[PDB]
């Protein structure tokens, strides 16, 4: 699984711009959103999840990435 | 039989071993069981030391089995006990104060009591004498009476039930019917008594 030019990448762009639009933040750039540390954590989790496979720790890592990316704690 | 004459039937009841110090004669029995170095058969797959089993259930479960489907036979016996429990629970709810503490909600109590009412007291065996057969009554043994009650239960609910009605629910109905001494099985038991009483003067033919 490759992160670049993937359907999961398209979902992330739509998911982040909606939050930025909801928060009334006018800064919008592909480099800005894709250069975030949280997205980097998301990239590592998804690539590991689809390649290594499902695991108790792998899903736990996936939970943390989504919670921090969606501002849910 | 792969077991020789020396092998014996194992003892499964755990309580028989945990409290032996309260008796003396029984202590001599099992201390010589291994002191004679008598071989013991392997534990049968059906019987187990679980406190939730019952010997009368296992025999009834085996007879319901057709072919080799023990899973299906056990599944049917599980639903039938559940089906009896559901009906008695519903009847308990819709009852008056005096009626509430009359209904029994224990399927095992119902199952044990039902079969003890379907057992004939005196059977018939044909005897040939003078070129003719006379139905002569005999005092059937306890094992035969217990087995005969189970066969009548299975025979009735397999033949004269409707095609739509399932087996577990049809057998549940007859257990309640036999619990109240009004089921067709009870009628069949009385019919065998009718023939035995009619031929009460032919009991002299038998020689045992």
């Amino acid at each position: 699984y490759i992160w670049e030019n993937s359907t999961s990448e398209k979902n992330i762009l739509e998911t982040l711009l909606q939050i930025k639009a909801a928060e009334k933040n006018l800064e919008l750039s592909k480099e800005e959103l894709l250069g975030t540390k949280e997205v980097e954590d998301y990239r590592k989790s998804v690539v590991s999840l689809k390649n290594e496979g499902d695991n108790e720790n792998t899903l736990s890592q996936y939970k943390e990435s989504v919670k921090r990316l969606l501002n849910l704690a | 039989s792969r077991y020789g004459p020396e092998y014996k039937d194992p003892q499964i009841d755990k309580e028989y071993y945990r409290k032996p110090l309260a008796e003396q004669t029984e202590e001599e029995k099992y201390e010589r069981d291994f002191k004679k170095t008598q071989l013991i058969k392997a534990a049968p797959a059906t019987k187990t030391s679980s406190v939730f089993e019952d010997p009368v259930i296992s025999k009834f479960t085996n007879m319901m089995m057709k072919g080799g489907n023990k899973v299906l036979a056990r599944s049917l016996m599980t639903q039938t006990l559940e089906a009896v429990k559901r009906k008695q629970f519903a009847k308990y709810h819709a009852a008056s104060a005096e009626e509430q503490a009359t209904i029994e909600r224990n399927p095992y109590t119902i199952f044990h009591q039902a079969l003890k009412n379907c057992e004939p007291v005196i059977g018939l065996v044909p005897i040939l004498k003078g070129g003719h057969f006379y139905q002569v009554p005999v005092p059937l043994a306890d094992r035969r009476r217990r087995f005969l009650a189970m066969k009548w239960m299975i025979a009735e609910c397999r033949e004269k039930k409707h095609r739509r009605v399932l087996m577990p629910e049809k057998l549940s109905q007859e257990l309640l019917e036999a619990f109240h001494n009004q089921g067709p099985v009870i009628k069949r038991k009385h019919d065998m008594h009718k023939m035995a009483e009619a031929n009460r003067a032919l009991a002299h033919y038998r020689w045992w």
Partner: protein, 353 residues
Amino acid sequence: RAISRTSEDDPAKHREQHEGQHYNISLQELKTVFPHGLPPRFAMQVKTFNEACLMVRKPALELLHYLKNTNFAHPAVRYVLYGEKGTGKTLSLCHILHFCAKQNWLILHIPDAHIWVKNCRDLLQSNYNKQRFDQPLEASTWLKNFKTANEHFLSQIKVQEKYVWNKRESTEKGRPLGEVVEQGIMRVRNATDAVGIVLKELKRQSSLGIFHLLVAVDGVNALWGRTTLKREDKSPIAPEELALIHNLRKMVKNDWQGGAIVLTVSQTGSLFKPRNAYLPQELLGKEGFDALDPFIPILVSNYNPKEFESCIQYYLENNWLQHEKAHTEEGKKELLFLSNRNPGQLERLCAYL
């Protein structure tokens, strides 16, 4: 000595320390909150007991905490429940469903998405799109259940579009949505189209502040897997051919605002999936998992020792375990070993001992 039903019944104030406690819910409450298919094992249990009780599980508390912090300005948040068979995933969803009904939310509850995939007696071709099929029997039953789920919103919602059923009857803008669903119930031929109209209208209007939309789909893995249903040539059809799945598919893609969807991937009703597989990825497959990220994979576990005692003591209060020796600790040990402290296996055992 265990505590079983002492906890006061309120979905809003359920806290972590109330773990393993049963709270009573009124029978009439089930009628107005669960008009869809309650799980048959639990539906049979409440009928006999005549008392509806549900135990507070950790996944229920974890999902409750996230719901209280939901920001309706943000887009929809996807929650999925996964676990081995018989762990009470559906009842955990029903615990969430009752909480949102208590808070007066808009409910879109699917009992089992597999029913809309397998064993359909009628397969009618669609009219809006020629290359699609309809399932009037399944769609009509859902509309009747959805009609009785809520009534205040069905009249408060105003439809603003131009909808034509046939050349003789049509529905114009301004009519309440309650009249539309009632038209679909009476006209079973267009009931499937009514379901899509109901789904799309709620999604478009969900951006407003008048809605607190909750969509509960059980068996989400059936929205992408292969379908048993065939056609006149006896050739399998893709899951996208079905109109009900195709429109419901648009209800899980995260694009609308002011809503939250709780999902659950199951195995009992799944098609072409092995018994042992329970993890989200293999159940959804490549396509199913692809169109669901991101989400929060909440895991449903078996009973803990504290919960196991509470469930056993609950049955003893209702006089369910009628065996003579079932009241002793030895019987409790056997129940723990045989059932592997699993709620699904425990219910089957207690039904006949």
